[model samples]
Target: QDAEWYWGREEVNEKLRDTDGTFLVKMHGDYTLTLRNKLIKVVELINHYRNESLAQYNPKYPVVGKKLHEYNTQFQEKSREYDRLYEEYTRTSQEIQMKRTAIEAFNETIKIFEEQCQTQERYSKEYIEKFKREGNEKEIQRIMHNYDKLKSRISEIIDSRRRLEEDLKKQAAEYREIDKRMNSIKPDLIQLRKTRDQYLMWLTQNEWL
Candidate 1:
């Protein structure tokens, strides 16, 4: 249906709007109008079938005849909609979870990198002091090679620290972006779950058989 396609398109746009926190600034009242409208349509469809089910003359008789056929038609239509929405929900949830997992792994790497930087810094400082002491000693020939080696090692550590800090900054920003994405998906996931549960409850209560 055209309406169904429009709803799906708007759902994607709505999610994009919500992703950056700018939705709060730009969105006017009734941001959920489209989604709520779809919800009401489904509710109305369910209610229409429920009313038909209730029109049956005898509770003892099976829900058959024209009324049964109409009810089944509405039920099947709603079920298809539910299935589509549920499949989308599962896919979105899985993607967000995978991204979350990646963020966790990245953060772990950042932690290790930071610890290595700290270790390198501590060792570099120690070597710098040792190099100074060796240079000041009268054993110039004995200490020249030792002093040069220590100085080179300190330079190497400094470079490694600089690179690690750059990498840490990049990883931190990446983590924040993924975290923001997960937050955006979380609310939608929750709402989808709630909708699924509510629909199932309605089906359970209003079974025609």
Candidate 2:
């Protein structure tokens, strides 16, 4: 109110018209800040909200800010690397998922073909026994001939499932390896986020976001 440098609206409501309050809470001997309103109003708002509104906070709502990021190299790089690995991380997992999907469906396919093989084998055994009893050599020979071809078809799908499973394992290995790198970057990314956010919190305290 006393500052000549401050902007104005209605002079009657001027002193308390547009105000913001800053407050912090100590949790487990730690200082946690949350930006908040005017002096008496600000005080009561904080007291009431500490019990109310802030408890229903959503952490994602305050993402927009002025383009102050380009001025800070630390923020750009940390944000860059975080999204970089983050992109790769999700991409890697998706690839693994795709392979996993293929494997599951392929396994189901192999089951149907395997069931076919069982039926064929049992039918051939029954037929060969009957044909031999009837001394029908040609019929027994035909059933024996069908056996190899059906066995080969089922084997083809089994190998496809085997190959897909191996490929999935390889992709999973790739994910695990990148996770090692990203996990190392994880702490660095968090620290950089805090360092930049500390600057952000400070800048906002000086001027609104």
* lDDT scores in order: 0.48, 0.62
Write down the RMSD of candidate 2 (Cα, Å): 11.2
State each candidate's clash count.
0, 1
Looking at model 1, residue 8 earns an lDDT score of: 21
Instruction: Report the CA-based lDDT of candidate 1 relative to the real structure.
Output: 0.48
What is the per-residue lDDT of model 2 for residues 32-75, given as tens digits with 9 covering 90 to 100?
Answer: 23343222212333345545544355542111255346435666
Tens digit of per-residue lDDT, candidate 1, span 92-194 = 5565566556556656655665565566557655655776766554555444555465556556655655665565556556556555655565565555544
**Position 32, candidate 1: lDDT:** 33
* Candidate 1, pairs of clashing residues: none
Off by over 4 Å in 1: 1-139, 206-209
